């Protein structure tokens, strides 16, 4: 009986594999030869932001592309103004071990999470003299890894209990629970249209989750080890996963199949954070080699390097207008990079 | 140079003032990661150490020894998979690893866990204070004469007490031999691979013992001293 279910699973797996191998007529390497090479894309440290005592684990920009939140293992969120290297808010935390942060699109809210297994939602625009803890979403079984706002009363979280969840802030309870991951979830990225979201976990697997149905949508394999970061292409028609096997990969959601594999013989250290520029043409990825690499998503060549950190690069995020690139690392520095003509 | 910029720089200055006042407290404390298993007396170590003190994924115990602050972190209510959150603990002063010496069944699991801790990247500079808990149970077990340790570790019939052993008064040689055999099992892993960048300090602790804070104090002192003496190219 149980072996019968094993055989049924094997049959479905084979059918999926064959159907996937059917609709793969052209590899993206062949159909991008006519594409002119990106060239060489160098960037320089326009600003360096200091004030964190310990490692920085998370970093998120805002909708205005000016303010950015950063979370450090000293129990501190700072809301920097990268234009002037000022500090607008410095919120201490209840738990000094934090691994994620967010920044609500309206600018009125930030979020944090970590080994305490709680998502703390902080209310900023209140105008009486202090920053209060608006809510403490609790109910996860393992550590949180990434949380991202849809709006001011809906949040999505990814936990080490092999699950993701959609919480209602004012209610406080979990509205939906997304289960189906064998290992613990590392990263989640919300669609540009806020309609689906992709998640990648330690089992070499990423998936789409339909927010308003609570069910999984597709699944993707190909990696050798833990997936550490994930991010949506400027539209919900692709997403790039960097894994702990020192490889990046590009996954579509129409073809339901790997698209490109970015790797080098030299690269042996893993990957921590990925992000896309506002063209789908610059995939930025931090590494444990104490450096960040630029990649191009249509040619699988480096076409860019970005060094300057003394320790592991642990964060990455481009702005909504494409103007800057923030990198936070374990040396407690936030480097805001921009190109030059 | 409006009034808005003036208010902004005033805010930045006040925030940096708070950051400095907090850095003074932060760098004047030592953070310790407490690891073990269910059968270990880890909860007893935490509870009986709540003396002179100044759901949930982390429990935090703050204790002061000789006007030095110590933070100890116990990871409760998280899954067994540990390869991901332990990376957060590379800046701690020490890892206090508690082991059930009087178990004889899960002790090889403890050795494998300790081997993984020792050889792990992001932990190649963090020293491990090794507590071999529940010593009275081991004493009575190898005194009564049941459950021979030879049957789980076959390198025991050819083991003589190291000459540098210091038995307590009123203790049989067999208790001493087992007690140091387990310590040797751990220390053999300790010195096999790790370079001089970190060391392992073993102690034969007991659940009811009232001295563990002082031991953590002394071995943290040794850790800092060894680090700084290697930076100076002494040692």
């Amino acid at each position, epitope marked *: 009986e149980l072996d019968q279910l*094993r055989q049924e699973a094997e049959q479905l*797996k084979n059918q999926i594999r064959d159907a996937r191998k059917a609709c793969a007529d052209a590899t993206l390497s062949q159909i991008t030869n006519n594409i002119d090479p990106v060239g060489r894309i160098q960037m320089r440290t326009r600003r360096t932001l200091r004030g964190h005592l310990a490692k920085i684990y998370a970093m998120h920009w805002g909708t205005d592309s000016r303010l950015l939140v950063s979370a450090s293992q000293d129990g501190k969120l700072i809301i920097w103004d990268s234009y002037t290297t000022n500090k607008v808010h410095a919120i201490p935390l209840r738990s000094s071990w934090v691994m994620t942060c967010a920044y609500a699109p309206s600018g009125n809210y930030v979020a944090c999470g970590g080994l305490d297994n709680i998502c703390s939602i902080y209310n900023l625009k209140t105008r009486e003299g202090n920053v209060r803890v608006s809510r403490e979403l609790a109910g996860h079984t393992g550590y949180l890894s990434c949380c991202r706002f849809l709006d001011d009363n809906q949040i999505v979280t990814s936990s080490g209990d*092999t699950t993701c969840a959609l919480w209602d802030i004012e209610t406080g309870q979990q509205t939906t629970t997304f289960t189906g991951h*064998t*290992g613990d979830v590392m990263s989640l990225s919300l669609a540009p249209d806020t309609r689906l979201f992709v998640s990648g976990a*330690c*089992d*070499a697997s990423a998936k789409l989750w339909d927010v308003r149905e609570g069910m999984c949508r597709q699944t993707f*394999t190909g990696h*050798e*080890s*833990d997936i550490n970061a994930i991010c949506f292409f400027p539209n919900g028609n692709a997403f790039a996963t960097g894994s*702990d*096997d*020192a490889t990046c990969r590009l996954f579509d959601l129409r073809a339901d199949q790997e698209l490109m594999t970015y790797s080098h013989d030299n690269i*042996i250290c*893993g990957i921590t954070s990925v992000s896309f520029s506002k063209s789908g043409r610059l995939l930025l990825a931090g590494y444990d080699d104490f450096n960040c690499n630029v990649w191009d998503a249509l040619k699988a060549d480096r076409a860019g390097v970005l060094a300057g950190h003394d320790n592991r690069v642990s964060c990455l995020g481009v702005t909504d207008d494409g103007m800057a690139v923030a990198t936070g690392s374990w040396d407690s520095f936030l480097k805001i990079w921009n190109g030059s003509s | 140079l409006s009034a808005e910029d003036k208010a902004a720089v005033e805010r930045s200055k006040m925030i940096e003032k708070q950051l400095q006042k907090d850095k003074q407290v932060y760098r004047a404390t030592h953070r310790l990661l407490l690891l073990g298993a269910d059968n270990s007396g880890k909860s007893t170590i935490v509870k009986q150490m709540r003396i002179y003190h100044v759901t949930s994924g982390i429990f935090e115990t703050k204790f002061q020894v000789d006007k030095v602050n110590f933070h100890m972190f116990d990871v409760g209510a998280q*899954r*067994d*998979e*540990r*390869r991901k959150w*332990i990376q957060c603990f590379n800046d701690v002063t020490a890892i206090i690893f508690v082991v059930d010496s009087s178990d004889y069944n899960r002790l*090889q*699991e403890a050795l*494998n866990d300790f081997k*993984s801790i020792w*050889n*792990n*990247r992001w932990l190649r500079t963090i020293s491990v204070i090794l507590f071999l808990n529940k010593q009275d149970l081991l004493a009575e077990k190898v005194l009564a004469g049941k459950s021979k340790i030879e*049957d*789980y*570790f*076959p*390198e025991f019939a050819r083991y003589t007490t190291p000459e540098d052993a210091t038995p307590e008064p009123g203790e049989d040689p067999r208790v001493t031999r087992a007690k140091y055999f387990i310590r040797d099992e751990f220390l053999r892993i300790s010195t096999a*691979s790790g370079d001089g960048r970190h060391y392992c300090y073993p102690h034969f602790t007991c659940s009811v013992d009232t001295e563990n804070a002082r031991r953590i104090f002394n071995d943290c002192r040794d850790i800092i001293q060894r680090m700084h003496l290697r930076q100076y190219e002494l040692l």
Partner: nanobody
Amino acid sequence: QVQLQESGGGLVQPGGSLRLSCAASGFTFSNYKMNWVRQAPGKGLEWVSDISQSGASISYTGSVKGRFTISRDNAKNTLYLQMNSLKPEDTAVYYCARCPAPFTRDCFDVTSTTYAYRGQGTQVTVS
């Protein structure tokens, strides 16, 4: 997908011989550390043997050093454990396990309750 399909197993009289083999597919076989993890009835998951990337380092446990032997070839993606002079305690389910990360000497969660990179298991019974 990280697939580790196992062979071998069955019922053998005490003092018997066997050769458990675990064929691997879906990852670079050469650059990983692998282990054997067995689960006896009414017991937790414990650790039997370990072999490294190039096979230079082989390690076992106390109750195995004299009977079982670990081996691996890289040209064929298989991991072998040769069993002989078995005991009633040896009767258990067996899983071939892969250490999480490549080019590392670190094997976390190899004996975990839930683990992604583990075999389905082969039963080895001894009277």
